[PDB]
Design an enzyme around this catalytic site. Structure first.
Site, PDB file in Angstrom:
ATOM      1  N   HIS A   1       0.779  -1.237   0.000  1.00  0.00           N
ATOM      2  CA  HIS A   1       0.000   0.000   0.000  1.00  0.00           C
ATOM      3  C   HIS A   1       0.813   1.291   0.000  1.00  0.00           C
ATOM      4  O   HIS A   1       0.210   2.336  -0.174  1.00  0.00           O
ATOM      5  CB  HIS A   1      -0.985   0.037   1.180  1.00  0.00           C
TER       6      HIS A   1
ATOM      7  N   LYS B   1      -5.138  -9.881  -7.415  1.00  0.00           N
ATOM      8  CA  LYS B   1      -5.798  -9.151  -6.346  1.00  0.00           C
ATOM      9  C   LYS B   1      -6.763  -8.172  -7.017  1.00  0.00           C
ATOM     10  O   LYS B   1      -6.311  -7.323  -7.779  1.00  0.00           O
ATOM     11  CB  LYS B   1      -4.784  -8.461  -5.425  1.00  0.00           C
TER      12      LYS B   1
ATOM     13  N   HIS C   1      -3.489  -2.792   7.637  1.00  0.00           N
ATOM     14  CA  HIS C   1      -4.502  -3.091   6.631  1.00  0.00           C
ATOM     15  C   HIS C   1      -5.061  -1.775   6.107  1.00  0.00           C
ATOM     16  O   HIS C   1      -5.240  -0.850   6.892  1.00  0.00           O
ATOM     17  CB  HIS C   1      -5.561  -4.030   7.228  1.00  0.00           C
ATOM     18  N   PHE C   2      -5.331  -1.708   4.797  1.00  0.00           N
ATOM     19  CA  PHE C   2      -5.962  -0.539   4.200  1.00  0.00           C
ATOM     20  C   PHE C   2      -7.450  -0.827   4.089  1.00  0.00           C
ATOM     21  O   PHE C   2      -7.842  -1.755   3.402  1.00  0.00           O
ATOM     22  CB  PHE C   2      -5.306  -0.228   2.848  1.00  0.00           C
ATOM     23  N   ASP C   3      -8.302  -0.076   4.795  1.00  0.00           N
ATOM     24  CA  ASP C   3      -9.700  -0.453   4.887  1.00  0.00           C
ATOM     25  C   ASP C   3     -10.549   0.195   3.789  1.00  0.00           C
ATOM     26  O   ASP C   3     -11.444  -0.453   3.230  1.00  0.00           O
ATOM     27  CB  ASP C   3     -10.260  -0.178   6.265  1.00  0.00           C
TER      28      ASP C   3
END
Length: 124
Positions: free
Chosen positions: A12, A41, A119-121
């Site tokens: 990210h 992905k 984590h990228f939400d």
């Protein structure tokens, strides 16, 4: 061996450019960052801010995560990001991506000691 924090950095973080390099950016980055290995992905976001700036988000606006956990944080400022979204024509192993650049607030999940993005939400 790769920490959760390092994996967030691999998946990210792209501080090396102010914005998306080109229409080509996602095709290149998704492979080089190893996001097209076992599958395409489907969606992934890169952040074009310093690591410090993104780590700082873990001390910013606490918000619910999409999965219902409470450890998510929204940036007070907008950030330069690039969304990569797989095309309908995309066929593994030739994973194909639409590159979209935007300035949006990011939402990250944070964990650990030290407390860092894992984590990228979402972006909003």
């Amino acid at each position: 061996k790769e920490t959760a924090a390092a994996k967030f950095e691999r998946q990210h973080m792209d501080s090396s450019t102010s914005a998306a390099s080109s229409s080509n950016y996602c095709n290149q980055m998704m492979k080089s960052r190893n996001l097209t290995k076992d599958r395409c992905k489907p969606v992934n976001t890169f952040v074009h801010e310093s690591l410090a700036d993104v780590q700082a988000v873990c001390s910013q606006k606490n918000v619910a995560c999409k999965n219902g956990q409470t450890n998510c944080y929204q940036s007070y400022s907008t950030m330069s990001i690039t969304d990569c979204r797989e095309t309908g024509s995309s066929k593994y192993p030739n994973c194909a991506y639409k590159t979209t650049q935007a300035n949006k607030h990011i939402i990250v999940a944070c964990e650990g000691n030290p407390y860092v993005p894992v984590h990228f939400d979402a972006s909003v």
